Write an enzyme that holds these catalytic residues in place. Structure first.
Site, PDB file in Angstrom:
ATOM      1  N   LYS A 222      -9.546 -51.089  32.064  1.00 46.04           N
ATOM      2  CA  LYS A 222      -9.462 -51.507  30.669  1.00 46.04           C
ATOM      3  C   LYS A 222      -9.508 -53.025  30.543  1.00 46.04           C
ATOM      4  CE  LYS A 222      -9.161 -50.738  26.335  1.00 46.04           C
ATOM      5  NZ  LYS A 222      -9.025 -49.305  25.958  1.00 46.04           N
ATOM      6  N   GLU A 291      -7.055 -35.023  15.222  1.00 43.78           N
ATOM      7  CA  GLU A 291      -6.492 -34.893  13.883  1.00 43.78           C
ATOM      8  C   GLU A 291      -6.261 -33.431  13.514  1.00 43.78           C
ATOM      9  OE1 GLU A 291      -9.011 -36.708  14.826  1.00 43.78           O
ATOM     10  OE2 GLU A 291      -8.435 -38.769  14.356  1.00 43.78           O
ATOM     11  N   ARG A 319     -11.286 -35.390   9.284  1.00 42.76           N
ATOM     12  CA  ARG A 319     -11.447 -34.437  10.377  1.00 42.76           C
ATOM     13  C   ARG A 319     -10.540 -33.224  10.236  1.00 42.76           C
ATOM     14  NH1 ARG A 319     -13.491 -36.265  15.422  1.00 42.76           N
ATOM     15  NH2 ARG A 319     -15.620 -37.013  14.982  1.00 42.76           N
TER      16      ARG A 319
HETATM   17  C1  LIG Z   1     -12.768 -47.626  17.737  1.00 36.45           C
HETATM   18  C2  LIG Z   1     -11.849 -46.600  17.137  1.00 36.45           C
HETATM   19  O1  LIG Z   1     -11.781 -46.463  15.907  1.00 36.45           O
HETATM   20  C3  LIG Z   1     -11.025 -45.767  18.088  1.00 36.45           C
HETATM   21  S1  LIG Z   1     -11.205 -46.045  19.830  1.00 36.45           S
HETATM   22  C4  LIG Z   1      -9.987 -44.762  20.190  1.00 36.45           C
HETATM   23  C5  LIG Z   1      -9.616 -44.446  21.632  1.00 36.45           C
HETATM   24  C6  LIG Z   1     -10.826 -43.948  22.480  1.00 36.45           C
HETATM   25  O2  LIG Z   1     -10.379 -43.709  23.828  1.00 36.45           O
HETATM   26  P1  LIG Z   1     -11.497 -43.753  24.941  1.00 36.45           P
HETATM   27  O3  LIG Z   1     -10.959 -43.365  26.287  1.00 36.45           O
HETATM   28  O4  LIG Z   1     -12.587 -42.790  24.536  1.00 36.45           O
HETATM   29  O5  LIG Z   1     -12.080 -45.226  24.993  1.00 36.45           O
HETATM   30  P2  LIG Z   1     -11.274 -46.530  25.440  1.00 36.45           P
HETATM   31  O6  LIG Z   1     -10.181 -46.875  24.438  1.00 36.45           O
HETATM   32  O7  LIG Z   1     -12.279 -47.651  25.508  1.00 36.45           O
HETATM   33  O8  LIG Z   1     -10.657 -46.314  26.796  1.00 36.45           O
HETATM   34  C7  LIG Z   1      -9.531 -44.212  19.020  1.00 36.45           C
HETATM   35  C8  LIG Z   1      -8.509 -43.120  18.927  1.00 36.45           C
HETATM   36  N1  LIG Z   1     -10.125 -44.775  17.858  1.00 36.45           N
HETATM   37  C9  LIG Z   1      -9.724 -44.296  16.577  1.00 36.45           C
HETATM   38  C10 LIG Z   1     -10.374 -42.915  16.168  1.00 36.45           C
HETATM   39  C11 LIG Z   1      -9.527 -41.844  15.774  1.00 36.45           C
HETATM   40  N2  LIG Z   1     -10.061 -40.678  15.418  1.00 36.45           N
HETATM   41  C12 LIG Z   1     -11.368 -40.493  15.419  1.00 36.45           C
HETATM   42  C13 LIG Z   1     -11.927 -39.127  14.996  1.00 36.45           C
HETATM   43  N3  LIG Z   1     -12.210 -41.458  15.770  1.00 36.45           N
HETATM   44  C14 LIG Z   1     -11.764 -42.674  16.144  1.00 36.45           C
HETATM   45  N4  LIG Z   1     -12.723 -43.674  16.512  1.00 36.45           N
END
Ligand SMILES: CC(=O)c1sc(CCOP(=O)(O)OP(=O)(O)O)c(C)[n+]1Cc1cnc(C)nc1N
Ligand SMILES: CC(=O)c1sc(CCOP(=O)(O)OP(=O)(O)O)c(C)[n+]1Cc1cnc(C)nc1N
Ligand SMILES: [Mg+2]
Ligand SMILES: [Mg+2]
Ligand code: NA
Ligand code: NA
Lengths: 544, 544
Positions: A222, A291, A319
């Site tokens: 990260k 969600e 969602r």
């Molecule tokens: C950008 C945004 O709004 C992000 S980035 C993220 C975490 C993704 O974890 P991942 O392991 O896939 O990637 P990483 O953090 O880079 O390790 C979330 C929950 N969100 C909020 C979110 C919440 N719920 C939904 C349906 N979509 C999003 N984008």
């Protein structure tokens, strides 16, 4: 003489392939430096994009975009993708009005295979592209990059089942930065070093032409004034976010009510629940990016006597529409929704603007909807929601409000508006963010009344009958779409009372709003103070 | 002398426990006979409930409902549950108005732990009940029965991840009748004979008090005039379902357009796609019970030039709200939605009545919405949707329409209404199912005009401006909720044109409608022909 001799010669993926594989590590070092120099601004997903530089470099070195389709889930990790696809010069204005999006966007470039912002969509999109590809006699490559977090999403997991069922050619890169698929029917390779660009290239060459779907599991790292306990972030000394008001409020409330249980779908910091999760660890739940699971788990708690609070952004609540309708509303369960990021959020653009909740929630029977004007009124709504039957929704924008002292818990009757400025000729009805504009617009104007329409469901039919009966014209303002929202609610009520005054419905147009500040979007939508003044003048009010 | 000596003495689960385990096989034989005798009526999920008799008998013999909570997914398989919990005498009137529901319902009995109808909700509900249980110092058992089909649902799979994360006491019975969970962190037991009630009892006794979540994998057997190629079902000789009209239509269309691709979420027969799937096997996709995956896969096809058709019931489309909004509408993709079971469906009750699609679809930018009055107009809409840009939705009720000859493909301009009966004093605006009532209501009445408002998005603003400008009163009728639906759309348009005629919005009230025939629900909602006549009389029209 330049810091990026390699990147200076790379204007697209076909220039990337001219390099030798031994030059790719040096290129990844240039890309990380470029991302830091240009994207170290405020509110940019810097760590995620830095972590994905090596996999993006290897994918574009091996595949032939735009004929090959590379899909990013969420899209926050694809800054190196944009840099390698002719948008290097535009990174300085990313997320700015008129600049490129913070996520990938089909409208922006032939290299952006999907428009994303919500998580877990890449897999189903990739399956559709693969099915379309085979239905067209073509053999281009389809590859999707999905993080460990997005993979927990329900639509990602279900799509995995179907992808393993159809058995079509596609590559899924699992970008795992948090330090099994036999029943799916999917080829599994890894885990491998997600920062070894030369090793990643070698693998992709020998996987991308195999038959059937494959998952490449890579491991990445990260990120390769006054303090606020709610969001865990330092803020301006005068600031006080709505998220922080909610966090303080529910932390106080739960100290006296053991029925209160807070559920978040992986947004503890944004919703302002860092302090809550530490003070009430036996009453805090994080269900990942699901969600759907958050709302139905809350319903299950409400069936067993608890008073759950679903903390969730407005855009993400979309969602869980059916779970609110089917799992919560049918039996009128005691679920309280505290809805952050209501209205235009701004720089995140069309995939994040929460301008629909006053429309889809309003059509669900039994779901009450409130809009607090300040933190005290937020606590009054939260107290009412937590002590009365049925579901309640409380929506507030991204932004600041006045800080209230501890123990503030007013009693309000749900469904009652309050007149904030006298006047009966033209009356403006507005709550929450729109109410700020309305009070500003009608500040000095005599005879222009302003009512805090702080409840959308139900409306204050008593006050609306009185005001609509005697007002020459009404003005409704909402940080929501004009279609089926607060304006439509007022018109439905007035018509059923056979009252026919002139009404001007001000709100977000029936059009997705591109990334730009909320002030700019509200100016072009026509709900800020000057635009309301313009409407007041068209109605015959003397405006300066 | 009686066929069911054991069942005659069983009025609840505490009487069941008085039997010996050797008597349980004989009881399961009585229960199957009782289900066949009483529930061999039309449109009853007989096979599923028969297949689950042994597991339900063993669960109630071992657990202590209502203190122990037994949750059924969907709930169609729980007839033996209702028979064993004091509702044996009510099975004769199940799904009838005033009788018991076809699914489990919290309002119906303390033994019905969740109100269900949509699939895959049991796991998240069970997690909430288990979390609430531990937050209350209690130790009752929580057990969920979920079928193999429901387990493919996204919210079931995601909930599994969280259940394995929280590590709380609960039992999941996988009822697998279609003839692995290490990464989840869940105890796995089976597969075992799902029809050996004594062996099932033995296992449940030695599993139900263990720590952490457990999955008991059981294997059961599914079910222990003129022909219609669309639904694969024989129908009345004169009948012709809307589902059959759609099936014939899209089967014809796909013969000439190779871009057309039909996606269903595990409802091939109901949507009328049996013949299609056999004529166009290279253009038919079934994604399981994952509406979310169906819509986003279609979006991925539309991005690659195809013209996908999502066939989906209105009530289930609620599950894909965000995928329609985020994955389809933001880039205005070429996805066509053919929406069956629109409006009141009747006997399936509140969990299935599709009376919200004209509300939540209408608030999404760019999503066109049409309502065909007959099969020819359905083909005109399908032809228009498949040859023009952006998403289109076409909704039709459960019921029959006039059969049209092959090759019928009219040209209609999308957004144009059509006047069906002259008259300018009172004008009724209605499409689809509501239009049948309107034409019936105003059949003889002179001066009462009737307009086929066959498009909800956009409205025919030209005709509405002309009609609203000169009509004394308007009447809008819709097989949809009155909140934010077609009535609200008309009022929003009229207000923005500053036209203020008297309008009566007729539709489903802001209340869930219990199981009963559609004719009964529409009579009590006030949209059938006599109720429209009543409104016409209140407006001053001479009615017999
Ligand atoms: C950008 C945004 O709004 C992000 S980035 C993220 C975490 C993704 O974890 P991942 O392991 O896939 O990637 P990483 O953090 O880079 O390790 C979330 C929950 N969100 C909020 C979110 C919440 N719920 C939904 C349906 N979509 C999003 N984008
Ligand atoms: C009743 C109903 O509407 C059923 S029963 C069923 C199949 C369930 O398979 P399962 O293996 O879980 O059980 P089985 O058929 O008895 O073997 C579906 C898709 N549906 C339709 C359906 C579609 N989509 C959703 C969200 N919910 C439902 N209930
Ligand atoms: Mg991650
Ligand atoms: Mg099954
Ligand atoms: Na409540
Ligand atoms: Na289209």
């Amino acid at each position: 003489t330049s810091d990026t001799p390699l990147l200076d010669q790379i204007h697209g993926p076909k220039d990337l392939k001219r390099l030798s594989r031994e030059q790719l590590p040096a290129l990844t070092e240039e890309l990380r430096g470029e991302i830091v120099r240009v994207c170290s601004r405020g509110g940019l997903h810097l760590a995620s994009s830095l972590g994905a530089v090596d996999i993006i470099t290897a994918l574009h070195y091996v595949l032939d975009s735009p004929r090959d389709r590379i899909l990013f889930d969420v899209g926050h990790q694809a800054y190196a993708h944009k840099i390698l696809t002719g948008r290097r010069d535009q990174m300085a204005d990313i997320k700015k009005e008129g600049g490129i999006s913070g996520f990938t966007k089909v409208s922006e470039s032939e290299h952006d295979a999907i428009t994303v912002g919500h998580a877990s969509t890449s897999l189903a999109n990739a399956l559709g592209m693969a099915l379309a590809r085979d239905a067209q006699g073509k053999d281009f490559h389809v590859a999707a990059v999905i993080g460990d977090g997005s993979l927990t999403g329900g639509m990602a997991l279900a799509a995995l089942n179907t992808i393993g069922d159809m058995g079509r050619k596609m590559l899924i890169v699992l970008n795992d930065n948090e330090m099994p698929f036999a029943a799916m029917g999917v080829r599994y390779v890894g885990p491998v070093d997600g920062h070894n660009v030369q090793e990643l290239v070698w693998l992709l060459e020998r996987l991308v032409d195999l038959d059937g779907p494959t998952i490449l599991h890579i491991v990445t790292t990260k990120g390769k004034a006054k303090f606020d306990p709610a969001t865990g972030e330092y803020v301006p000394s005068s600031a006080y976010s709505w998220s922080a008001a909610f966090g303080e409020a529910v932390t106080e409330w739960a100290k006296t009510d053991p029925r209160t249980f807070v559920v978040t779908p992986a947004m503890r910091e944004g919703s302002g629940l860092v302090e809550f999760s530490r003070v009430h660890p036996h009453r805090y739940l994080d269900v990942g990016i699901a969600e759907e699971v958050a709302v139905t788990t809350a319903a299950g708690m409400a069936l067993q006597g608890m008073r759950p609070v679903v903390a969730i952004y407005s855009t993400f609540l979309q969602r869980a529409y059916d779970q609110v309708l089917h799992d919560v509303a049918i039996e009128h369960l005691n679920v309280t929704f505290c809805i952050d990021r209501a209205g235009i959020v701004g720089a995140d653009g069309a995939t994040h603007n929460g301008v629909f909740d006053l429309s889809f929630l309003r059509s669900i029977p039994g779901v009450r909807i409130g809009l607090p004007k300040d933190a005290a009124e937020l606590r009054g709504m939260l107290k009412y929601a937590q002590t009365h039957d049925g579901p309640f929704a409380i929506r507030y924008p991204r932004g600041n409000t006045a800080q209230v002292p501890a123990g503030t818990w007013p009693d309000l009757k749900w469904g009652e508006w309050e007149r904030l400025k006298g006047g009966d000729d033209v009356v403006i009805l507005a709550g929450g963010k729109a109410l700020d504009y309305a009070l500003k617009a009608a500040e000095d104007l005599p005879g222009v009344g302003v009512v805090n329409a702080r409840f959308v469901k139900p409306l204050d039919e008593e006050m609306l009958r009185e005001v609509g009966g005697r007002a020459r014209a009404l003005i409704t303002v909402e940080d929501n779409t004009v279609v089926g929202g607060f304006g439509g609610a007022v018109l439905e009520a007035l018509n059923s009372m056979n009252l026919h005054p002139t009404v001007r419905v001000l709100g977000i147009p029936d059009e997705f709003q591109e990334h730009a500040t909320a002030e700019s979007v509200h100016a072009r939508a026509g709900i800020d103070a000057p635009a309301i003044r313009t409407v007041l003048a068209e109605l015959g009010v003397d405006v300066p």
